[PDB]
């Protein structure tokens, strides 16, 4: 059932993730320092997000079929998916011991109060925590984790897509790979309705995307706040 091409796809996505995710979190020392005291966490979290957008781009470039698209379509897909892929990939450091993102040290252990000290409200933070918990409870294999990130990126219904037919064909190769992987390698009971549960998480991400863009647009409208963002964040999330 799991064809040789499908095993190839999984191998590439695993390697792409390993080359774009550093579980030592050593680069966090280059960010502007976190200040927990005003939006005191905006500079650190802006650098953290900007750093992760770069990692998301590096992963997306290695998705089988992604570079067959036009440059315009690659840009639309990454602009619309970046915040969602960051939410997905940040689950690797999320802990249910205390509902925090543990990135190796106390300075880099982030909770709900750090998100609020970047300007965001419970309208986003509450559904964000529920999403992180529900995704962690799925206990995805690393193979399913990287497949879900790739499917999120290559979605044909994103606004501004030109060749939606080509985007769908690429995602279909990935969706069938995931569906077959669950039916051959994920033992029950963990596999029960697992594909449908993962597709529900993509729907949850669309709603989280909308609320983040809403709060981002209000935060970035004040020039004092935009001044603390990075050039890449302004290009991807909006100016």
């Amino acid at each position: 059932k799991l064809s040789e091409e499908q095993q190839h796809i999984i191998a590439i996505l695993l390697d792409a993730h390993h080359k774009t995710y550093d579980p030592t979190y050593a680069d966090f020392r280059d960010f502007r320092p976190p200040v927990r005291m005003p939006l005191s966490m905006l500079p650190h979290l802006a650098d953290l997000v900007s750093y992760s957008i770069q990692k998301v781009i590096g992963f997306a470039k290695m998705i089988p079929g992604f570079r067959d698209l036009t440059s315009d379509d690659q840009i639309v897909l990454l602009k619309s998916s970046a915040i969602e892929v960051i939410m997905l990939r940040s689950n690797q450091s999320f802990t249910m011991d205390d509902m925090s993102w543990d990135c190796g040290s106390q300075d880099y252990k982030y909770d709900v109060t750090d998100v609020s000290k970047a300007g965001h409200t419970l309208e986003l933070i509450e559904p964000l925590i529920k999403f992180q918990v529900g995704l962690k409870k799925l206990n995805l294999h690393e193979e399913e984790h990287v497949l879900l990130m790739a499917i999120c990126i290559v979605s044909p219904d994103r606004p501004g897509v030109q060749d939606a037919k080509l985007v769908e064909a690429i995602q279909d190769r990935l969706s069938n790979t995931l569906q077959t992987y669950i039916r051959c390698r994920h033992p029950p009971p963990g596999s029960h309705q697992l594909y449908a549960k993962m597709i529900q998480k993509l729907a949850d991400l669309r709603s989280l995307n909308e609320e983040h863009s809403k709060q981002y647009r209000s935060l970035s409208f004040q020039p004092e706040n935009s001044m603390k963002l990075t050039p890449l964040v302004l290009e991807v999330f909006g100016n």
Binding site: I75, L78, E235
Partner: peptide
């Protein structure tokens, strides 16, 4: 329009 995204996608 998106020169930094474009360059990282190169």
């Amino acid at each position: 329009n998106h020169p930094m995204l474009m360059n990282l996608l190169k």
